[PDB]
């Protein structure tokens, strides 16, 4: 016997064509929600939709353009009626690494625009529906650079750091009108370093992982859970290891 | 093409202790773990109480009276479950008692902040030692904590409980750094929850922590659904601890 | 006293306020200062003022044609540079909803302080590195610490630059250079375009009431006393470290304290 | 020059190490100052040294009794207590795992690090509270800030110190009285020690440099004076940047 945790549930899901989205959309549709796929790649998008069905529906969205973001936002209330979940999780890098000393003002800002603008404007247009509603959750997917230095450039840190920061001041703002919001932050495989440096021997990261937290954190089984930052990373980012493995 | 949702027995085959299990946030998780198809040792003092969700729960739930801050009743606990089961998967470690409601540094008794330590932060300890000695041979095992969201926020709880609740998110993070070599999660569940005053001042407005809140927390830390979560404070106070709303609430 | 002799400092947004303060105290302590700003009627009155070790450049710090020449004009004029101190920084509102908040504005924000102090590390790096010293320093703000004090773009850039501050201090490290910030209570804030001096001062006056540490207000110069350590000798092993000066406002939810 | 002058200090623990370090540097900016420990013949000998500024009390932190003596004649000496630094620390061990942690080991490293300094705490609380002024320090650790640094028995410690310092900060403020913490990298039997601090100076993240005794101390001297009033709930932490990096990814490359 199996149960629908998000039944009845409206979702959006930016970024939702690919990688951890489009896992977060099988999952959240196997859960009985409708899901509405928001994201620039219309191919691998309007796929998912033929391969689930009527509860799926595709969108092409800029996140980092407004325009984008308020039809988005406003398609799916009015397909719908309601919006009980705005996920966050379209993201970029610039680089696998590098130093600031070659970091280039136009790729930070590109990385800000994607990563920290859209998730602003997805936020703030949810919230533009979820006020009068009285209800609602917003997710952002952050990353575990959020919670230490040392795992992405100098660009994408910052961007996720602040995501989390408007993960913790929207939550403060919007829980008078009983909206809750989080972040789901996980580690790498958005796998050869990241396994064997990892803290969590003998795991490794799927995109299930991440799609599973934001499950959690988006049903009425975290009915008072917000301004949470929900980090996946096996332990990553809550030790420096120096000294252990030089032991 | 037609949705499947997820299966109801989320911890379907594994074996978990939960201390403090026979009241409160321990007996809501024992009830929703025995849900979800756990063999659930119940570990307390209360020994009627304990016994009579055995009876209601049948024979998946067991009661074993422990003392967590007895380093002999704890060894007893992981030992007979480990006789009775062939293994431990899940050790709750969720006992946890305060002091008092609220007071003043300059009122604090010794005695009571050697007691708040003895059950939530010792205990804490012992109960982690002896979960890693039978877990480590496993190379798998999921070792929880009941901290507090006063863990992450000042104003909330009394020195001594407040003191305790950041020593056990430390141990927690020191724990999944020294035993996910071995392949073992280490988390903790920080509820909110005077509980009328709680619910009126707390940051998200519609809705009131129950104990049920804390127990899904626990639910999905101890589920294979969380089996990269590692190092994780899970703070269940709806935004409680992120938020200083003095000056929201002057505007 | 002299705790920076014969240092060269740079601080951007440094004539007027918090940057201000700590041109003074850095000057005091023998550090050569140069102000970045864009006010430079104020700016030319301090370097009058002060004399031969204090000197103004017009810098817009979100223009990287400006750092680059604020660096290295710095470096042409006194050989080194030892302190960055990226102290220039902006708010949209001292206050306001997600709802009625610009993409304009934010991203205005983000360009000022994020952007302006990403382009300061990066050129302050440049010369710091064959160096193997140097402190690059940020002046981030308590709202990264805690919500319900900034607005959702200004708390956000402040939570961005902390994190940068770290991740520089993890690169840098390895060429023997440190990298911190300050974290002041309050509303702290250059000119900007729509910034009202009204509404400064009417959340100025509530912070000021609302504070965790009563009988004292945060003053300029608790920051710029703060930059003095986190810039001295005296620090030569801190790195990475969110120096907040807020009484203990960000550490504590009074809500239940208030209520009983 | 002398940025303590007039300030009446206590330092438990201030008979070696950064206790002594701190002792030296508050005398040395013009403070009087309470050496509090149980090292008796090299606390008189820093007392002789120095001058009828600093003096000596004998002092095991986790007695009551002696926490109270160390504060009420303290007032009694000087009339005021202006700062109470509550350094005194023990370690388990340099490093072990949880499979071998003794009880009685925990309780000790508790009893000395944890309920010391809530007794010192309380007890000048006592004292500044109607003086509505005071600095009330602890010495925690930078293992309060990382996962991978200290033992479990230490690492919870200074955890439930750093929180304790916050919890104070918010009761204290309304009086006045600021509370902070200074948390060092170092580890601070001897060679045991050495061994560790040695790989904590090759693993260190802020190369070119070495923690010295100076730089906690250093910190503190600044938490203490009016340099830092507006400093409360503080942590400040002295690592070189050691607890906000894992550089496992950068040193696989």
Redesign the interface.
Known sequence: ?????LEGKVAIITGGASGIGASAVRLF????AKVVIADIQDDLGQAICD???K?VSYIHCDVSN?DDIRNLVDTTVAKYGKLDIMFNNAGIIDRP?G???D?E?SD??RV?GVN??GG??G??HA??VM?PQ??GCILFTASA??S?????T??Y??????????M???????????I??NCVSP?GVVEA?LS???????????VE?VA??A??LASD????????N??????????????????
């Open positions: 016997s199996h149960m629908k945790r549709w196997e859960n009985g391969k689930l069905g509860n407004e690494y130093s600031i000393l970091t003002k930070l800002e800000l920290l603008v602003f404007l936020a703030k919230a533009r006020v009285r209800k650079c959020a230490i230095a040392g795992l992405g100098h660009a840190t910052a961007s996720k750091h602040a995501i989390v920061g408007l913790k001041n929207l939550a403060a703002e919007l829980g008078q009108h009983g809750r919001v580690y370093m064997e440096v990892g803290n969590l021997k003998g795991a490794v990261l799927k992982d599973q937290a499950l959690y089984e975290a009915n008072y859970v917000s301004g949470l929900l980090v996946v990373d096996g332990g990553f980012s809550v030790v420096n290891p120096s000294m252990m493995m030089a032991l």
